[PDB]
């Protein structure tokens, strides 16, 4: 009953600390992959893995 809560607390704190280390090491804004104006760029997810680059062009150039 208590050892489980202890393991949940440790894994949660361990992750939170890894979160602080990742935020300090990696900078989202300073990303080479990211380019262009942020208000211009768009984000699309749940895309099928078979979608060819040309297929995504023909669908988002419209």
């Amino acid at each position: 009953e208590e050892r489980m809560e202890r393991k949940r607390r440790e894994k949660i704190e361990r992750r939170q600390q890894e979160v602080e280390t990742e935020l300090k090491m990696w900078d989202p804004h300073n990303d080479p992959n990211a380019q262009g104006d942020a208000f211009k760029t768009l984000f699309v997810a749940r895309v099928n893995y078979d979608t060819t680059e040309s297929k995504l062009r023909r669908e988002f150039e419209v």
Binding site: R58, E59, E61, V62
Partner: protein, 51 residues
């Protein structure tokens, strides 16, 4: 030739350069769509791009 008007106030209204998009089609919501050439054939649309 640019068009000049007189009412005095005078206007120039000169054209500079053209930009031609690709074939696009809008529904009621305003969604542009890529008209398959087949889609234009099927829906009796016109394969044209806005200028």
């Amino acid at each position: 030739p640019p068009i000049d008007l007189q009412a005095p106030p005078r206007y120039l209204l000169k054209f500079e350069q053209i930009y031609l998009s690709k074939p696009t089609h809008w529904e009621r919501d305003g969604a542009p769509s890529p008209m398959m050439p087949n889609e234009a054939r099927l829906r009796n649309l016109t394969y044209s791009a806005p200028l």
